[PDB]
Amino acid sequence: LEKNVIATQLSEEAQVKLEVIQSLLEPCDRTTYGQKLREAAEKLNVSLRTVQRLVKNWEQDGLVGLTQTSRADKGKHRIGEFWENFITKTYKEGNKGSKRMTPKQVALRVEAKARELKDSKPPNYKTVLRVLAPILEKQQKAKSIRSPGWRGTTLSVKTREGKDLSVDYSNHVWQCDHTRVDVLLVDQHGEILSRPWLTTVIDTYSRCIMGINLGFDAPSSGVVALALRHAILPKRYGSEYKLHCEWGTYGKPEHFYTDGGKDFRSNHLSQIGAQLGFVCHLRDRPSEGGVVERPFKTLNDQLFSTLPGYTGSNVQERPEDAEKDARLTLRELEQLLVRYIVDRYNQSIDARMGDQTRFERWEAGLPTVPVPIPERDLDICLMKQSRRTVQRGGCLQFQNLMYRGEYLAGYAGETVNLRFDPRDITTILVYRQENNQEVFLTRAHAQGLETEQLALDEAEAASRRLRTAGKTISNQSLLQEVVDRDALVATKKSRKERQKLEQTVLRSAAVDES
Partner DNA sequence: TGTACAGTGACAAATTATCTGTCGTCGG
Partner DNA sequence: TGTACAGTGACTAATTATATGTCGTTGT
List contacts with DNA (CB under 7 A).
41, 44-50, 53-54, 57, 68-69, 71-73, 78, 102-105, 125-126, 129, 146-151, 154-156, 207, 286-291, 293-295, 297-298, 301-302, 345, 348-349, 351-352, 393, 448
Nearer to a copy of itself (CB atom), residue 25 or residue 483: 483
Q: What does the chain come to in residues?
A: 514
Name the 3-class secondary structure at 61. Answer: coil
Residue 498 in the binding site for a copy of itself (CB under 8 A): yes
* Binding site residues, Mg ion, CB under 5 A: 177, 259, 261
Q: How far apart are CA 415 and CA 400, in angstroms?
A: 18
Residue 439 in the binding site for a copy of itself (CB under 8 A): yes
Write down the least CB distance from residue 497 to a copy of itself, Å: 7
Judged by beta carbon distances under 5 to 8 A according to partner kind, the member of DNA, a copy of itself, Mg ion, none in contact with residue 44 is DNA
Q: After which residues is the chain broken (C to N over 2.5 A)?
A: none
Judged by beta carbon distances under 5 to 8 A according to partner kind, the member of Mg ion, DNA, a copy of itself, none in contact with residue 259 is Mg ion
Query: Residues 135, 349, 364, 461: which binds a copy of itself (CB under 8 A)?
Result: 349
Write down the least CB distance from residue 473 to a copy of itself, Å: 6
Q: Which long-range contacts (CB under 8 A, 24 or more apart) does 52-57 make?
A: 54/17, 54/20, 54/21, 55/21, 55/24
Q: How far apart are CA 428 and CA 447, in angstroms?
A: 12
* Segment (H or E) for 148: none
Query: Residues 75, 148, 162, 374: which binds a copy of itself (CB under 8 A)?
Result: 148
Write down the least CB distance from residue 473 to DNA, Å: 12
Residue 301 in the binding site for a copy of itself (CB under 8 A): yes
Asked if residues 399 and 426 have their Cβ atoms less than 8 Å apart, the reply is no
Options 147-155, 223-231, 251-259, 504-512: segment touching a copy of itself (CB under 8 A):
147-155
Name the 3-class secondary structure at 297. Answer: helix
Write down the least CB distance from residue 262 to Mg ion, Å: 10
Cα 272 versus chain centre, distance: 23
Q: Which residues in the 30-59 window bind a copy of itself by CB under 8 A?
A: none
Mark out the alpha helices in 94-202 (DSSP H runs): 103-117, 125-131, 133-142
* Segment (H or E) for 398: strand 396-398
Asked if residues 212 and 199 have their Cβ atoms less than 8 Å apart, the reply is yes
Compute how many residues bind a copy of itself; rule: CB under 8 A. Answer: 126
Q: How far apart are CA 281 and CA 276, in angstroms?
A: 15
Residue 310 in the binding site for a copy of itself (CB under 8 A): yes
Write down the least CB distance from residue 173 to a copy of itself, Å: 22
Per-residue contact string for residues 254-293; x = within reach of a copy of itself by CB under 8 A: ----------------------------------------
Write down the least CB distance from residue 348 to DNA, Å: 5
Residue 96 in the binding site for a copy of itself (CB under 8 A): yes
76 exposed, middle or buried (CB, 10 Å; 0-12, 13-18, 19+)?
exposed
Q: How far apart are CA 339 and CA 343, in angstroms?
A: 6
Mark out the alpha helices in 96-220 (DSSP H runs): 103-117, 125-131, 133-142
List 438's β-bridge partners, or say none: 433
Residue 60 in the binding site for a copy of itself (CB under 8 A): no
Q: Which residues in the 177-206 window bind a copy of itself by CB under 8 A?
A: 183-184, 186, 190
Q: How far apart are CA 420 and CA 427, in angstroms?
A: 7
Write down the least CB distance from residue 201 to Mg ion, Å: 13
Nearer to a copy of itself (CB atom), residue 33 or residue 340: 340
